[model samples]
Target chain A: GGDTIFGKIIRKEIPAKIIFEDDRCLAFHDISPQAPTHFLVIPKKHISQISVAEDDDESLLGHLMIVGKKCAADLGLNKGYRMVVNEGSDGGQSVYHVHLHVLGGRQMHWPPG
Target chain B: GGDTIFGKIIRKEIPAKIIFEDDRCLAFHDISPQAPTHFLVIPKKHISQISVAEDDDESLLGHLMIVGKKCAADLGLNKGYRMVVNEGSDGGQSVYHVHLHVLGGRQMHWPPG
Candidate 1:
């Protein structure tokens, strides 16, 4: 399931406006934007299940946050941006592919839950 | 402003069920629980505005994560747990004091939005 949602975008199966991409990560515009600037930073490696993140997957997890910040900078959010990895169903993760949401460039609300 | 909310908690002006504490950080139960296992990890230093985090604040941020994990372990959530910081208004942060929500010990939901 890691590739199920992202492969569609990767293979052009679903049209996604690509913003940034590295060898191991991809940043794209969310179909339904939640803020003035919203992007999904996803890892190349399949990680459909985030809760099962291996203890040895340190590099991958680190890569996710690094890319997330890079994407925020690219979007002119260097001043600030929110990097969120909504884990599991209760955390509000939708796609099984491990991804982080970079949102900013506007007044953000609090108590998100 | 930085000490407005947390100072009360620290001084017992507002009663909090303290679970763990150290020289740099503190762990306590959320007044309103949203999960089976929910607690907040906070730094001892007063830093109210999350938007103004300094690059020099690396150690403080790192300590936040470590404390969150230790508290989770102390709470018997070794199997799994979620670390979350509601950074700004839209991100769901209430108290100005920086904190991480450690949540788990039960099934979660998806599409947090």
Candidate 2:
């Protein structure tokens, strides 16, 4: 499969309100933000999507979670936030690249099952 | 706060449709099903909530994500699923213990930024 838009963001081929970055992942503001504080943390590696992520990606997957949390905290989302990862068509995922959505600044509906 | 209901579940003091378990975390069917396949993956440790998760809890947080994905795959949600973590009241988190919600079996709404 070809590289996704996130690949461009990672390569600095496009402009994004970048937030945090490390060896494993990068955080940036969402272009079409749904919340007052909306951003996404994505792994630098192109894993396509969460469904295709393999067992060997465990540490990298875990590192993303840690980075997402630190970025949210750094952004002063002290009150609360909703972290989400959508997989496949049924999961409302349009982008192929795996991304962790951190949305806050207002109450997120649905406690989720 | 006194151990949340999840703590009880961890201690086996409460009855839950347990699905997966390991030294670091546990997965169980959600009592209030929001999808055809609904379950929660949570760390065995009392994290209170994602907002309170510390750097030391990084591996544990990542562990939960990996477990959640594996359980979803095992449950035959080959189509897709939405994995979510709600933090604080605005984030729709009722239980103090951090839990990752895995909901699928149909198309989830909202593409999410």
Candidate 3:
């Protein structure tokens, strides 16, 4: 369902440390910190995951990246950060809603899978 | 430098099994694939990395995601996949130019660095 935990967070039904907000998308800290600087940026639209993202969602999808970049810069993660999008079960997607994870403040790893 | 290995691939100087190519972006199999189906999508423009993605680059960024999805579908990775963007050194980014890694045909791990 699109109305997953992230939907609640977006609706303010579930409280979250919102980092940035725009009409199209929102950014907030992940409930479980993956790194010293960890957060998630999601679209207000109910996109279950990246696979379900339609062709018209190009701008929306791109907006998430831009917002994530802005949030990283604002958080003083100027040195760098990791952006991840988990798709389907094999992709380690615990949450159905599409989200971009920004992790930094420490050295990250490759072949993330 | 923008003229990293990927830049060569884009310019057709350094040969790669290019998977997909459009005016804006390109996709190809990772020479050192971490998974059974692992490829990378990079913007044709010489962006140093994600941090440098500008406000006006929203369309370009989103285009990459869409193209990546299409390439995955074309490659029969319908089961699932992981999309990752490593920013700066702390994010495990080796190449300077920006690229999105799509890994699938296996289970992906979390807290990816």
Candidate 4:
């Protein structure tokens, strides 16, 4: 795909309510949130999807999860949360950029869709 | 929790249709399939939930994702898939053991619930 909104957010070309950032990734609020604390953890360098990420991207991918967990704790998701990565249109990937949806602060349901 | 069903699966005390395995993790089919292809990628040690995982569990958490990607490809989910980790009852986490749900072979929905 092409550069997505996440890419713009990462580049500061657009504004975002950023919650976490490091050399490799950034976490921010989702514009159309589905949960009380809905945010995304994305790599600074946009990757199309998890299936398409290069093998060398392992560490970076792993880093995303670590950051997601930290953000959940910092955001007071002590009850628990959900982390999701949807790939492709059928998978509910509205944006092409690979990102982890870190959702919490309310009860999440089953069948997860 | 005291040895969830997943813990028994990891210990080979129970039978599961395992799809992937390593020294640290294991992947298997979800008995209650939410999609045509629904499985789980979990740590062998049986952590209760992602929020409870130790800091040193970073690499292991990341490894779950990498394996999820590989398994999707190997399982022919070229159309794409969804990876999700539900953390508690409110998050649809029936099993106390931490596990990543790898779902594909069908169109996943939005709001992801």
Considering every candidate listed, which one attains the maximal TM-score? 3
Error of 2 at B17 (Å): 0.4
Stretches of model 3 off by over 4 angstroms after superposition: none
Local distance difference test, each candidate: 0.66, 0.85, 0.88, 0.86
Worst 10 residues of 3 chain B by lDDT: B1-10
Instruction: Name the 10 consecutive residues with the lowest summed lDDT in model 2 chain B.
Output: B104-113
Model 1 stretches astray by more than 4 angstroms = B1-36, B40-83, B86-100, B104-113
Where is model 2 more than 4 Å wrong at Cα? A111-113, B111-113
- Residues B1-113, model 1: lDDT tens digits: 14667778876688788988877778899888767888887877787644555545555665665566567767876455556655455555677787767776765443233
| Model 4 C-alpha lDDT per residue in residues B44-97, reported as the tens digit of each score | 876888877776777778788889899988888888789999887657788988
| Cα-based lDDT at residue B86, candidate 3 | 89
lDDT of 3 at B56: 91
The lowest-lDDT stretch of 10 consecutive residues in candidate 4 chain B is B1-10
Cα error of candidate 3 at position A98, Å: 0.9
- Every candidate's DockQ is 0.19, 0.61, 0.81, 0.69
**Tens-digit lDDT track for model 2 on B1-98?**
13999999999998999899988888999998888989999888888987767777877777787888889999999889999988887788899999
Ranked by lDDT, the better of candidates 2 and 3 is 3
- Model 3 misses residue B11 by how many Å? 1.2
